Design a protein around this ligand. Structure first.
Ligand SMILES: [Mg+2]
Ligand SMILES: [Mg+2]
Length: 386
């Protein structure tokens, strides 16, 4: 719900520029339930848009130079819905540099533009987040007691930077380790980090589909004392099996929410959530993205369902995610991964008390190095202009 009234029909997309910014993760990410080592290396595709002689910056995907050629000249006021929402056709490619621009021009943070009546203007935005960096980093260790320590120490690194909530990767038995040994190792790791997290610490687990329903039940029973907040993708989403699991957790009065949605989602996932089998929805912050999320969040709140936008692989989305919490009431967490992108200043954001602090600086509050971006655009990227 952007405000198209302040927008003039004079304002025109004048130049689109593309660059892939690169970085490192603070600590290398290992394997998950289904695939191998993730690594330390990170990249982000960013577009730089010029309207009315002012530059916007932001994430951009599925945009080839020929996509850009076509959009040049167009009125900014044209790419928007009647209700003040970027048209679908431009959503992935330009939604982020466009929104950034809007804030830059208006001298306002994007979250103020998209504001709900649940939050108020002048009041700071501080959003809960969680540490998502706990991968299968123990697979070189035969000694279960060693593995726990390594995982606890990784968690302490996050605790030291202000993280108080932890998503722990599970499903070691699915592919990478013998099923039983792996499964046991999954439990001992979660038990291990749960100490290191303390009692107020929220623990999430994510199996990246490496379980079935009896494995999940076996795992959850071995964690009934752990402050388990949610359980993410125990197996690919199936209503019947989740209907069996909610009722199972109900019997035992064990309060774990069920989260799902990332990747190639079941096209009936939402409906399954409205029939009460999935509590938390996890579509990616880049794809389908911000504008979709804004539309989706609303429906989700009407149903008293929860919004947890997936984010991993793209640092930029962490910061975007935070802004979205202003447009959705039942927003859950910012999926935080500690990454440093060259040319991408995020120091205006702060991590404290298991919470992310969103700056009042215009747009998405990220300061990009105009120069190195211009250096990268020229070196390996591209430009389209009049
Ligand atoms: Mg996941
Ligand atoms: Mg799934």
């Amino acid at each position: 719900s952007l405000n198209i009234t302040g927008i003039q029909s004079d304002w025109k997309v004048e130049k689109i520029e593309f660059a892939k910014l690169t970085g490192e993760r603070a600590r290398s990410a290992g394997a998950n339930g289904r695939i191998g080592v993730h690594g330390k290396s990170c990249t982000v595709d960013i577009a730089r848009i010029t309207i009315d002689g002012q530059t916007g910056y932001g994430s951009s995907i599925h945009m080839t130079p020929e996509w850009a050629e076509d959009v040049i000249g167009r009125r900014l006021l044209d790419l928007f819905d009647d209700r003040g929402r970027l048209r679908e056709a431009y959503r992935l490619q330009l939604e982020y540099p466009v929104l950034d621009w809007l804030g830059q021009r208006q001298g306002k943070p994007v979250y103020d533009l998209v504001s709900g009546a649940h939050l108020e203007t002048g009041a700071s935005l501080v959003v809960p987040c969680y540490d998502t960096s706990l991968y299968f980093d123990d697979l070189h260790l035969a000694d279960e007691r060693a593995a726990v320590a390594l995982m606890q120490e990784e968690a302490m690194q996050g605790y030291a930077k202000g993280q108080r909530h932890f998503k722990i990767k599970v499903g070691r038995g699915g592919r990478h380790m013998p099923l039983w040994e792996g499964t046991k190792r999954d439990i001992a790791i979660v038990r291990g980090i749960s100490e290191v997290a303390g009692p107020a610490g929220k623990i999430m687990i994510d199996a990246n589909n490496a379980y079935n329903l009896n494995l999940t039940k076996e795992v959850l029973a071995a964690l009934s004392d752990v402050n388990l907040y949610w359980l993410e993708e125990a197996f690919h989403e199936d209503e019947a099996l989740y209907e069996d699991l909610k009722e199972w957790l109900g019997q035992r009065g064990q309060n774990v929410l069920i989260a799902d949605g990332e990747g190639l989602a079941s096209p009936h996932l939402i409906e399954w959530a409205t029939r009460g089998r999935v509590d938390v929805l996890q579509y990616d912050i880049i794809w389908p993205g911000f504008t979709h999320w804004m539309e989706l969040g609303e429906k989700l709140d009407a149903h008293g369902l929860r919004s947890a936008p997936h984010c991993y692989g793209n640092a930029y989305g962490i910061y975007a995610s935070g802004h979205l919490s202003a447009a959705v009431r039942n927003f859950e967490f910012v999926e935080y991964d500690d990454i440093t992108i060259e040319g991408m200043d995020v120091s205006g954001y702060r991590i404290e008390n298991g919470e992310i602090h969103v700056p009042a600086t215009p747009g998405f509050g990220i300061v990009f190095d105009d120069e190195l971006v211009t250096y990268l655009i020229n070196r390996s990227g591209w430009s389209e202009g009049h």
